[PDB]
C-alpha cells in the first residue's frame, strides 16, 4: 500500500529519496505539500 | 534507451533520484520541464 | 544516534541523500539550516 | 581524487544523488555552480 509521510515538499521530484530511504519504495508524489510514497 | 517521466523539473539535478529509483538509471536530464532518464 | 553534517539545507527532503551517502542513515532532518542524520 | 560533472547546482545537497548515481561516490560539493564528486 501507500505510505504517507510528514516530509514537506513542493514538487514530486523531492519525494524520491525520502520514499526510497524510509520505505524502500520507488515511487513518490508530492500531495498537498507532503511526500506520499507508493 | 531513455525513459521519459511525468515528473516536473526546473533543473537536471532534480531528476537523478527519480531516474535511479524508478528505472535504475544513472543519469537524469530536465528536458522541456520534465525528467528524462538514461 | 545522530550524526551532524555541515551540508546546508532549507528543507528536510534535501537531507535524505546526504544522510544515506555519508552515514548509511535512512533519516535526515534540516535543523537550523544544516543536515542532521539519524 | 575528485570526479567533476557538468551538472549545474546552487547548493552542495543537490550533488549527492548525482555523485552516487554517476560514480558511486558518497560526497558531493557544488563548486562554482557545478557538482564535483569525491
CA distance B31 to chain A (A): 14
CB neighbour list of residue C1: distance below 8 Å, 6 or more residues apart: C38
Chain D residues with CB under 8 Å of C8 CB are: 11-13
Rg (CA), chain B: 8
- Cα(C13)–Cα(D4) distance, integer angstroms: 24
CB neighbour list of residue C27: distance below 8 Å, 6 or more residues apart: A21, A22, C16, C19, C37, C38
Choose from D16, D35, D38 for mutation: most chain C CBs within 10 A: D16
CA distance B2 to chain A (A): 18
The separation between CA D34 and the C-alpha centre of its own chain, rounded to angstroms, equals 7
| Chain B: touching chains (3 or more CB pairs < 8 Å) | A, D
Put simply, the answer to whether D18 touches B16 (Cβ < 8 Å) is yes
- Residue B38 has what DSSP assignment? -
CB neighbour list of residue C25: distance below 8 Å, 6 or more residues apart: C3, C19, C37, C38
Q: What angle do CA A28, A29, A35 make, to 5 degrees?
A: 85
| Cell matching residue B37 | 532518464
| Cell matching residue D20 | 552516487
Describe the crossing of helices C15-23 and A15-23 by its angle, rounded to 10 degrees. Answer: 40
| Cell matching residue C32 | 537550523
- Cα(B18)–Cα(A30) distance, integer angstroms: 13
- Cα(B15)–Cα(B23) distance, integer angstroms: 12
Choose from A10, A16, A30, A38 for mutation: most chain B CBs within 10 A: A16
3-state secondary structure D6-38: EEECCCHHHHHHHHHHHHCCCCEEEECCEEEEC
Q: What is the set of domains in chain B, with CATH numbers?
A: 3-37 (3.30.30.10)
Phi, psi dihedral angles at B15 (to 5 degrees): -90, -15
CB C32 within 8 A of CB C4: no
| Cell matching residue C1 | 544516534
Strand, coil or helix: C34: strand
Count CA within 13 A, CB hemisphere, residue B23. 17
Indicate the pairing of strand A28-31 with strand A34-37: antiparallel
Count CA within 13 A, CB hemisphere, residue D35. 28
Give the distance between the most distant pair of CA atoms in chain C.
Answer: 22
- Residue B27 touches partner A, C-beta closer than 8 Å: no
In Å, what resolution does this model reach? 1.9
Distances (CA, A) of B14 to B8, B11, C4: 9, 6, 24
- Residue A37 touches partner C, C-beta closer than 8 Å: no
Q: Which of A10, A5, A2, A3 is nearest to A30 (CA)?
A: A10
Amino acid at each position: 500500500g501507500s505510505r504517507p509521510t510528514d516530509i514537506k515538499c513542493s514538487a514530486s521530484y523531492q519525494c524520491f529519496p525520502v520514499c526510497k530511504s524510509r520505505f524502500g519504495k520507488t515511487n513518490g508524489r508530492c500531495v498537498n505539500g507532503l511526500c506520499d510514497c507508493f
